[PDB]
RNA sequence: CGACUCUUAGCGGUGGAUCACUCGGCUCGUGCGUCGAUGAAGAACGCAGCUAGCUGCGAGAAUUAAUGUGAAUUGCAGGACACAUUGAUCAUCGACACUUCGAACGCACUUGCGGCCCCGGGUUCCUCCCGGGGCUACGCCUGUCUGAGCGUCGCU
């Protein structure tokens, strides 16, 4: 070809995607952050009830 | 007289010696002689109906399953187990599960910021938003692919 720059750069090559012969872990881990784990229990304090009545917010 | 002071004895007290005890040590001896990227040791934070610490455990958290055992656990309560339409408790333990750091592994140590490939929901191939899953560290070995070289050459 032709060289127009005095700098030699590392030529770009081919990079294959991973095609494993086996998965390293047998199964995906179960998501232990479901809806039941997110909500633990409501608050029932005096401040909490004031938000339910005067603010339309659950705590 | 008393008070005060001294001594002795009795009894009572500031005190915890002595004696008796010991699920603890120390020493000797015997048999084994086994950790970890399939993530160790060590940390952190959590987990009980009432439970702070010790202990045990890991979001299935003072435990699940299985086997053996065979009627308890216990401080209170509650309800199992009808005590074979097979099972309380305990032991054993080979199945399952095992949060965050840590050799610690996408980059960085602040609950900071990414990238690639998939899945679900809003919209519909904006992959734009949210949620989830799998990968994404260094060194090094065999092989594989893609390359470089006025390195040595061959055919042109």
Swiss-Prot record:
Modified positions (Citrulline) in chain numbering: 3
UniProt similarity note: Belongs to the universal ribosomal protein uL23 family.
Domain of life: Eukaryota
Function: Component of the large ribosomal subunit. The ribosome is a large ribonucleoprotein complex responsible for the synthesis of proteins in the cell. Binds a specific region on the 26S rRNA. May promote p53/TP53 degradation possibly through the stimulation of MDM2-mediated TP53 polyubiquitination.
Intracellular or extracellular location(s): Cytoplasm; Nucleus
Post-translational modification note: N-terminus is methylated by METTL11A/NTM1. Citrullinated by PADI4.
UniProt note: domains: The N-terminal beta-like import receptor binding (BIB) domain mediates interaction with IPO5, IPO7, KPNB1 and TNPO1.
Residues with PTM Phosphothreonine: 7
Residues recorded as bearing Phosphoserine in the entry: 5
Protein name, per record: Large ribosomal subunit protein uL23
Subunit field text: Component of the large ribosomal subunit. Interacts with LYAR and GNL2. Interacts with MDM2; this interaction may promote MDM2-mediated p53/TP53 polyubiquitination. Directly interacts (via BIB domain) with IPO5, IPO7, KPNB1 and TNPO1; these interactions are involved in RPL23A nuclear import for the assembly of ribosomal subunits. Interacts with IPO8.
Coiled coil: none
């Amino acid at each position: 070809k032709i060289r127009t720059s005095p700098t030699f750069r590392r030529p770009k090559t081919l990079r294959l995607r991973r095609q494993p012969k086996y998965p390293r872990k047998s199964a995906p881990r179960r998501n232990k952050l479901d809806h039941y784990a997110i909500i633990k229990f409501p608050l029932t304090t005096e401040s909490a009830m004031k938000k339910i009545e005067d603010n339309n917010t659950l705590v």
